[PDB]
Amino acid sequence: PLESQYQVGPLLGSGGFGSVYSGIRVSDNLPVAIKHVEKDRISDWGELPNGTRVPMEVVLLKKVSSGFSGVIRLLDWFERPDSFVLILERPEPVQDLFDFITERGALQEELARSFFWQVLEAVRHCHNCGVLHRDIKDENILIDLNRGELKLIDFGSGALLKDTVYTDFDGTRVYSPPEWIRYHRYHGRSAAVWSLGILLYDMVCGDIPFEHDEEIIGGQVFFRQRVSSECQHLIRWCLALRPSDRPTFEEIQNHPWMQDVLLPQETAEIHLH
């Protein structure tokens, strides 16, 4: 039974991702987030090894939710007559990276490096697990402000990872690559790398570089804040117009700008506490 197991709290937010509430699990008072998604809005369905037919989001979360990682984990889920309910982890205290950058402005490079590194590790983990998120953006990253750990959320636009072309997309357009804009075609890793370039620019400049389709396909990166030459280089590499000119995850993590990353705990002590 869903309603006797969780105590429901205030609405945290709602939108394309459903309605998400704060909650506490009654059995041990563990903090949780409770996401409701209406069946009529689930366009993408999977199946569990169960054989149970579930929203794709549940399949993806289960594939990435084993062990520890930088992904907010699915603790449980339930089906209702017109909806699915997902019980997700809830770090406390938390702020999403969109609000963090709004409030703090452009991030010092040491902070952006630590954050960006953790996002890279999380995305690697998803890919190791056969999962493509397809909506990497500041809004979909939560910062645990005490542990200095970043956590990916909202896999509702994601897919199983494959090596062949994707011709569908439900993520955020201003983080989508130019081959999607021009051709409605992209490959998973290369499109992920582009969204990571958008994210890194967002971190060191205080907002994303592009709003309009013509800017996305122009691939001219104007720097609106002082950014080091090494960081500009990495961003511009991630934002290569030709997908095959973008770095691999390995190349991003071996980039000189990425060396000497702070530990999560040092990050919290220096930058968040």
Partner: peptide, 9 residues
């Protein structure tokens, strides 16, 4: 200059 969220889903 205006910073805003951008919906998906």
């Amino acid at each position: 200059r205006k910073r805003r969220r951008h919906p998906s889903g």
